[PDB]
């Protein structure tokens, strides 16, 4: 009956373009207990307050977690034209959302660090024209098409990736480019909470 937060606290967090998603239904959470394990640097919310989201009932609660540097805070808005919201990760507006940038402390030894932070700064498709480019903007709550070609961690800032397509996939090429950010002393992560309301299925409630 307790919401399983375990996969977030163990292993290496994926990059922003490969965010892992925990879907919580029919359970009971203590969110403040989870955020107490970290060092919360920024906690903003939309269509809901942070104080409420740790204390209300929903039919379903989704928690996306990934590796994210605190220097690119300005880029994790959804009213932004940055590469993060363009090609990597984007939250939906039709339901309350919350965004949390946290830092793994010394007391949390069960989360491993990767070599560096990595994000996509270009993910477009070249048409059978071989002249026409159609930038592949990611949709809300979805993965970019270029996750098929961009590896789990960009080896070097500037690496470009390509994949020729069959006529049944639209022909032409799928094309992407990588970029990196230096790793910090302690791991810097981001969390995206997104709640939904079913009719009789108000099942995810904080415990007492």
């Amino acid at each position: 009956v307790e919401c399983d937060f375990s996969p977030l606290l163990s292993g290496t967090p994926p990059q922003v373009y490969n965010f892992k998603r925990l879907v919580f239904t029919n359970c009971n959470y203590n969110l403040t207990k989870l955020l107490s394990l970290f060092s919360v640097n920024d906690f903003t919310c939309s269509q809901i307050s942070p104080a409420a989201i740790a204390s209300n009932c929903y039919s379903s609660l989704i928690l996306d977690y990934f590796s994210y540097p605190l220097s690119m805070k300005s880029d994790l808005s959804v009213s932004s034209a940055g590469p993060i919201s363009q090609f990597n990760y984007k939250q939906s507006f039709s339901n309350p959302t919350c965004l949390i940038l946290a830092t793994v402390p010394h007391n949390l030894t069960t989360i491993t660090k990767p070599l560096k932070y990595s994000y996509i700064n270009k993910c477009s498709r070249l048409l059978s024209d071989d002249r026409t480019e159609v930038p592949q903007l990611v949709n809300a709550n979805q993965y970019s098409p270029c996750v098929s070609i961009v590896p789990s961690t960009v080896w070097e800032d500037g690496d470009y990736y390509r994949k020729q397509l069959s006529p049944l996939e639209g022909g032409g090429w799928l094309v992407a480019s990588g970029s990196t950010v230096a790793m910090t002393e302690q791991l810097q992560m981001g969390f995206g909470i997104t709640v939904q309301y079913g009719t009789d299925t108000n099942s995810v409630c904080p415990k007492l």
Partner: protein, 183 residues
Amino acid sequence: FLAYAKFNDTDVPRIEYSVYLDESLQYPKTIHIPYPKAGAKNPTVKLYVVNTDNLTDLEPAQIVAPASVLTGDHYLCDVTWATKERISLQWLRRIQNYSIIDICDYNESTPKWNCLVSRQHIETSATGWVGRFKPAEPHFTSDGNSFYKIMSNSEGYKHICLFQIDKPDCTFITKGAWEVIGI
């Protein structure tokens, strides 16, 4: 702004030849030079732009090459500043019959350099290669909204074409059975 290019010859084969220096030098020096012969690994190239006024805060901002050129190896053959905040990049496919000009404007936030797709400009050749030794460089107007450059026409004669940034076609301002050497 300072735009600079980053070359990477890490995996490019190096030619070696001996240098038999002065009669006092007893052991000749071997000289290593990254030299991509026909078919070898070419050096990669990236283009970065830096804000010289306030640098200690910000980083270099990479300007990625268009997708039309990212289908393989490619060259960077011209960098021209149109205005104080606009930059033009000529890219060139490794198979040198496909070049493209990229017009990139500066944005107050990220992305620092916004390159609209509608102001890309392609240059191809079905007979041979593009240009004489490299495609002509764009000669921008004062306002950076149009540039004259040298192109081949239907009869295959290098003449001056009038390019509009946002419009896809160009207009020849000369013609004849003769060529233009340079603007």
